[PDB]
Amino acid sequence: GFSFNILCVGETGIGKSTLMNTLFNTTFETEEASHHEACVRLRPQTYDLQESNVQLKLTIVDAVGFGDQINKDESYRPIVDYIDAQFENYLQEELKIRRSLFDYHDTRIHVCLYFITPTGHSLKSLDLVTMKKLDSKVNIIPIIAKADTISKSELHKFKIKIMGELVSNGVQIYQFPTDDEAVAEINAVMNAHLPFAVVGSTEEVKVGNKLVRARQYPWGVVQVENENHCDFVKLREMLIRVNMEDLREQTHSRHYELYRRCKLEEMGFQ
């Protein structure tokens, strides 16, 4: 029984709401955004559900209107303002004389799913700028959205150019844990498959003799849970209780502690 806070950062209409509904095998009521939002708005929605035998208080945070403005210089600021606000309210709890840490609702972002549009080249200018502002504050999981757009040969070379650009620019992304020996080999291939090439769909297409979530084209059927088609099953493995707990621990012991050092020295503590 714990909270889990997912931050979705992607361009408008990239498939964020769909992929959320596909990951949890449900549907969270959200509204389609327009492209004419003056600023990026951070919109959170909290849901009480059970995933992987956990009483989950899930908060899905959407950066509304990302990538829509003609001028996108400080597009990251509303996102950092939200992330920093949750670090701030948590630090206030620690600084209380009479505290209540066990009843406290942890609102800190534990995952950031960064949807990369499948252009087929490298990274956009907005992806590089924003991820560099977020990599020391959230656990970034880069994903290639609408991956049913990219053929397997293009996707292979596309992943390499994306990862190569994160390395050369020094973007720290999340890494699935390799410490415990039971999940060493499996997490090694989870990290090796980043960025995950995902496809989201809640519509059910009959394939053979089964109703499977998929997208129906005149030329074929993209099965969401087919690992030859996309990496949705691999991404969903972040929702097992082991990986959720690690994403929360890194959030606390690394990103929050870095914020904490900065705030406390700003406040005057030694």
Partner 1 sequence: FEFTLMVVGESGLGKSTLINSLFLTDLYPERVIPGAAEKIERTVQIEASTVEIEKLRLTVVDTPGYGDAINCRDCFKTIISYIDEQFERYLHDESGLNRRHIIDNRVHCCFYFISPFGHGLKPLDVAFMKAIHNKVNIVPVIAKADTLTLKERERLKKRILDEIEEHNIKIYHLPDAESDEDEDFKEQTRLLKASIPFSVVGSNQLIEAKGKKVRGRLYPWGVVEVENPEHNDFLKLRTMLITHMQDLQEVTQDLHYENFRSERLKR
Ligand X SMILES: Nc1nc2c(ncn2[C@@H]2O[C@H](COP(=O)(O)OP(=O)(O)OP(=O)(O)O)[C@@H](O)[C@H]2O)c(=O)[nH]1
Ligand Y SMILES: Nc1nc2c(ncn2[C@@H]2O[C@H](COP(=O)(O)OP(=O)(O)O)[C@@H](O)[C@H]2O)c(=O)[nH]1
Residue 21 binds to Mg ion (criterion: CB under 5 A): no
Tokens of 257: 């502690």
Task: Work out what residue 17 binds among ligand X, ligand Y, partner 1, none; the CB cut-off runs from 5 to 8 Å by kind.
Answer: ligand X
Q: How far from the centroid of its chain's Cα atoms is residue 261's Cα?
A: 25
Site size toward partner 1 (CB under 8 A) is: 49
Give the C-alpha separation, 149 to 153, whole Å. 12
Q: Is 107 exposed, middle or buried (0-12, 13-18, 19+ CB in 10 A)?
A: buried
Closest CA to 260 of 117, 136, 173, 132: 136
Of the candidate residues 3, 5, 17, 22, the single one contacting Mg ion (CB under 5 A): 17
Taking CA atoms, 127 is separated from 9, 112, 117, 154, 195, in Å, by 10, 13, 10, 20, 13
* Residue 46 binds partner 1, judged by CB under 8 A: no
DSSP state of 238: G
Interacting residue with partner 1 among 53, 71, 209, 270 (CB under 8 A): 71
CB of 214 to ligand Y, least distance (A): 17
> Out of ligand X, Mg ion, partner 1, none, which partner does residue 200 contact, by CB within 5 to 8 A per kind?
ligand X
Residue 88, annotated as binding a ligand: no
Q: Residues 67 to 126: which contact ligand X by CB under 6 A?
A: none
Query: What are the φ/ψ torsions at residue 113 (nearest 5 degrees)?
Result: -85, 110
Which residue among 41, 120, 124, 205 contacts ligand Y (CB under 6 A)?
120
Q: Vertex 265, ends 262 and 268: CA angle to 5°?
A: 150
For ligand X, the closer of residues 18 and 251 by Cβ is 18
Q: 3-state class of 15 per DSSP?
A: coil
Residue 200 annotated as binding? Answer: yes
Residue 108 interacts, among Mg ion, ligand X, ligand Y, none and using kind-specific CB cut-offs from 5 to 8 Å, with none
15 is in an annotated binding site: yes
Q: Which of residues 72-111 bind partner 1 (CB under 8 A)?
A: 72-73
User: Which entry of partner 1, ligand X, Mg ion, none binds 152, CB below 5 to 8 A by partner kind?
Assistant: partner 1
Residue 162 vs 183, nearer CB to ligand X = 162
Q: How many CB atoms lie within 10 A of CB 35?
A: 11
Question: Three-state SS for 174?
Answer: coil
Give the shortest CB-122-to-partner 1 separation in angstroms. Answer: 6
Residues tagged in the binding site annotation for GTP? 10-17, 65, 146-154, 200, 215
